[PDB]
Design an enzyme around this catalytic site. Structure first.
Site, short mmCIF file in Angstrom:
data_model
loop_
_atom_site.label_atom_id
_atom_site.label_comp_id
_atom_site.label_asym_id
_atom_site.label_seq_id
_atom_site.Cartn_x
_atom_site.Cartn_y
_atom_site.Cartn_z
N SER A 1 0.82 -1.23 0.00
CA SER A 1 0.00 0.00 0.00
C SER A 1 0.85 1.28 0.00
O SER A 1 0.28 2.37 -0.14
CB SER A 1 -0.85 0.01 1.27
OG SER A 1 -1.99 -0.89 1.12
N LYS B 1 0.45 3.53 -3.07
CA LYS B 1 -0.52 4.65 -3.10
C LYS B 1 0.12 6.04 -3.14
O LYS B 1 -0.46 6.98 -3.69
CB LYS B 1 -1.51 4.54 -1.94
CG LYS B 1 -2.46 3.36 -2.05
CD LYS B 1 -3.43 3.31 -0.87
CE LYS B 1 -4.37 2.12 -0.94
NZ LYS B 1 -3.69 0.83 -0.65
N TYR C 1 -10.85 2.91 4.69
CA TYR C 1 -9.67 2.60 3.86
C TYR C 1 -10.01 1.58 2.78
O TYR C 1 -10.65 0.56 3.06
CB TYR C 1 -8.51 2.13 4.75
CG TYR C 1 -7.17 2.03 4.05
CD1 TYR C 1 -6.25 3.08 4.10
CD2 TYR C 1 -6.82 0.89 3.35
CE1 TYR C 1 -5.01 2.98 3.45
CE2 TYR C 1 -5.60 0.78 2.70
CZ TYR C 1 -4.70 1.83 2.76
OH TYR C 1 -3.49 1.68 2.13
C1 LIG Z 1 -1.73 -2.10 1.70
O1 LIG Z 1 -0.58 -2.58 1.82
N1 LIG Z 1 -2.85 -2.78 2.10
C2 LIG Z 1 -4.06 -2.09 2.61
C3 LIG Z 1 -4.66 -2.68 3.91
N2 LIG Z 1 -3.86 -2.40 5.11
O2 LIG Z 1 -3.56 -1.04 5.23
S1 LIG Z 1 -2.13 -0.57 5.60
O3 LIG Z 1 -1.98 -1.05 6.94
O4 LIG Z 1 -2.23 0.86 5.48
O5 LIG Z 1 -1.27 -1.16 4.64
C4 LIG Z 1 -4.87 -4.20 3.73
C5 LIG Z 1 -3.56 -4.93 3.31
C6 LIG Z 1 -2.75 -4.27 2.19
C7 LIG Z 1 -3.05 -4.83 0.81
O6 LIG Z 1 -4.16 -4.69 0.28
N3 LIG Z 1 -2.02 -5.45 0.21
O7 LIG Z 1 -2.16 -6.01 -1.07
C8 LIG Z 1 -2.36 -7.46 -1.08
C9 LIG Z 1 -3.86 -7.76 -0.83
N4 LIG Z 1 -4.74 -7.02 -1.73
#
Ligand SMILES: *C(=O)N1C[C@H](NOS(=O)(=O)O)CC[C@H]1C(=O)NOCCN
Ligand SMILES: *C(=O)N1C[C@H](NOS(=O)(=O)O)CC[C@H]1C(=O)NOCCN
Ligand code: NI
Ligand code: NI
Lengths: 357, 357
Positions: free
Chosen positions: B60, B63, B147
């Site tokens: 993430s 982003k 989010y």
């Molecule tokens: C980003 O790495 N994300 C977004 C979310 N967690 O937020 S963060 O703590 O700000 O990173 C969920 C996990 C993660 C993903 O979506 N990673 O990509 C693999 C799964 N779609």
């Protein structure tokens, strides 16, 4: 969503009518998205409507949260399921809990611990301790399932001890937040009390759950449909959480034995899916709660995933809750009511909804 | 620089041990000079060591790059943050995205777009379009932060459309080179695969991120500690790039609303500095990613400069990344690991380092 709306309306309304249920919140997780349906009144006296934010007592559904804490303790290497119970509470050393494991306690196979604590055991450390110290088993450990609040209650209390903090503190400070929950409590804060539904008992009197020994561990959670579905979604996708909490949830998705069609996990009880309504109702019937049953022990722990229904019922004097999810189909369901109406009727609503998803 | 070494070693090593992290790359920008610390293994199988050139998945954190492309589109007067989403994709006209702004999408306030696309949505334009066309808000636009990968994913995609090219082409041909980056990729080229670290999952399996809808926009970047610090350095001194790209970076340093202690920018999330470890950890906690929060909107956009910490966390099944900088102190930090270890632990490392500078 008018299609899902029509399905839920058709499932819910006849049962609400037949059981004189004042208020009932449904939350469904379908194809990765939440859907809420909020029926009737949270309170009959002041006419507050049920919303997805209304707080209900979930009773024995609380055991899934208790299991989650114990799952965490495992990931932190603070306890192991084969541990003797008295390893984690010196006060029980020398008692029968020298020969009863944490797994036995978690899965109600300690040897006949009753449904509730004796009426004479107050919410008091010394009285609870003394009860376990003096307790005489009816069976050898690991042979007879007898659904028991003192059994899993002790499991939860020992998990807390293994982590070196009170159960309540660990739940409020660590467990609920790690699950992504903020409207889920053991004791509803003053600020959120206006959301707390009134319960309605057998005699239609307004009721809320009173304190008891190990209430927090066994039956003490209050939450909303929205927050409880967030919990279901974490169960469906433990990867929404940090590693150790994902692993904690994974630990509650392992089956240890069968009774009839039901496979017993930590908190969660599982079934093949699809299964007949009649068989699902039987798994959730009064004899399952009140009779001892011989267990059919699995050769190894079984992952409770794929085409399976994991569920838990829970009631208090004024409330009736049911939660279920199908891991291999990404389906999740929460039904919370402010009357203690029959388990079979809850399953009836859930089955009609899940059958149409 | 043995003094910085002592600080970094002390911050990193215990956390690597506690979380069984095979490999971790630290890059620090201090007083305008880079410092690299490279720990452990990029692959347990072949024992390839971590270096400042090792490629990690940053999840993430991608982003922030997505926000920079959008920043560029804004500078080129191709879009404005107030634009209705459907202005930039005629296929969405007649949907709810007629009444949702680019800013709503960017800052996760469109009205309940979920954390992820439903597992049933494939990396396919028609399916992605149909998802958005059928999507119905849980909340009014601009009211609740939840989010969301589909949310900022659409923002990036629409920014690309406004510039008249695929998102992937713009990032590779224009955005990365403009930032002075050559080891930063949405898809790692054959020539660079020998640098790509293996990831290690919840269960210790070797894992690399697979394709998904809007993955490039949401979580698809692979980069080295060295290249990501180069990006951080661009953020600390935007005037170091071509005028339009300086302005593009400035666009990502503007805050639109607050949730708790956190001020939400495009990609970047900001805090006062100094702030307590506890508060910084809460800002990067699970309830922040999984609960809806009512926003407190700022009367005008706030320049995220001076005594503030701007940061972003990112994970994949096998990787854990954290980036932070303090504009008013000219401090920059990158921490990349090939295990998805808890956000709180990443912040623990970063806080220990930043507090000692
Ligand atoms: C980003 O790495 N994300 C977004 C979310 N967690 O937020 S963060 O703590 O700000 O990173 C969920 C996990 C993660 C993903 O979506 N990673 O990509 C693999 C799964 N779609
Ligand atoms: C849990 O809600 N229980 C356990 C038991 N029935 O099992 S269930 O059908 O699985 O729920 C008896 C009723 C109930 C409680 O003990 N509830 O707590 C309030 C009264 N002690
Ligand atoms: Ni899934
Ligand atoms: Ni400067």
């Amino acid at each position: 969503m008018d299609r899902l709306k029509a399905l839920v309306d058709a499932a819910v309304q006849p049962v609400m009518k037949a059981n004189d249920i004042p208020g009932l919140a449904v939350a469904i997780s379908l194809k990765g998205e939440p859907h809420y349906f909020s029926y009737g009144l949270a309170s009959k006296e002041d006419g507050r409507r049920v919303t997805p934010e209304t707080l209900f007592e979930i009773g024995s559904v609380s055991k899934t949260f208790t299991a989650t804490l114990a799952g965490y303790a495992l990931t932190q290497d603070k306890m192991r399921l084969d541990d003797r119970a008295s390893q984690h509470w010196p006060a029980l050393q020398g008692s029968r809990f020298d020969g009863i494991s944490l797994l036995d306690l978690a899965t109600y196979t300690a040897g006949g611990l009753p449904l509730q604590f004796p009426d004479s055991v107050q919410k008091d450390q010394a009285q609870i301790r003394d009860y376990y110290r003096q307790w005489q088993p009816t069976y050898a450990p690991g042979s007879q399932r007898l659904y028991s609040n003192p059994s899993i209650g002790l499991f939860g209390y020992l998990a807390a001890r293994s982590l070196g903090q009170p159960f309540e503190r660990l739940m409020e400070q660590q467990v609920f937040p790690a699950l992504g929950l903020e409207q889920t409590h053991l004791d509803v804060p003053e600020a959120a009390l206006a959301q707390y539904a009134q319960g309605y008992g057998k005699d239609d009197r307004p009721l809320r759950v009173g304190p008891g020994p190990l209430d927090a561990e066994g039956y003490g959670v209050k939450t909303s449909a929205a927050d409880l579905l967030r919990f279901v979604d974490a169960n469906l996708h433990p990867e929404r959480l940090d590693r150790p909490w994902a692993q904690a949830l994974d630990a509650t998705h392992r089956g240890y034995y069968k009774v009839g069609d039901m496979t017993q996990g930590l908190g969660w009880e599982a079934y093949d899916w699809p299964i007949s309504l009649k068989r699902l109702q039987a798994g959730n019937s009064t004899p399952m709660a009140l009779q001892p049953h011989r267990i059919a022990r699995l050769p190894a722990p079984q992952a409770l995933e794929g085409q399976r229904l994991l569920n838990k019922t829970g009631s208090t004097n004024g409330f009736g809750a049911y939660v279920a999810f199908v891991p291999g189909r990404d389906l999740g369901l929460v039904i919370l009511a402010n009357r203690n109406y029959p388990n079979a009727e809850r399953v009836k609503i859930a089955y009609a909804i899940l059958s149409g998803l």
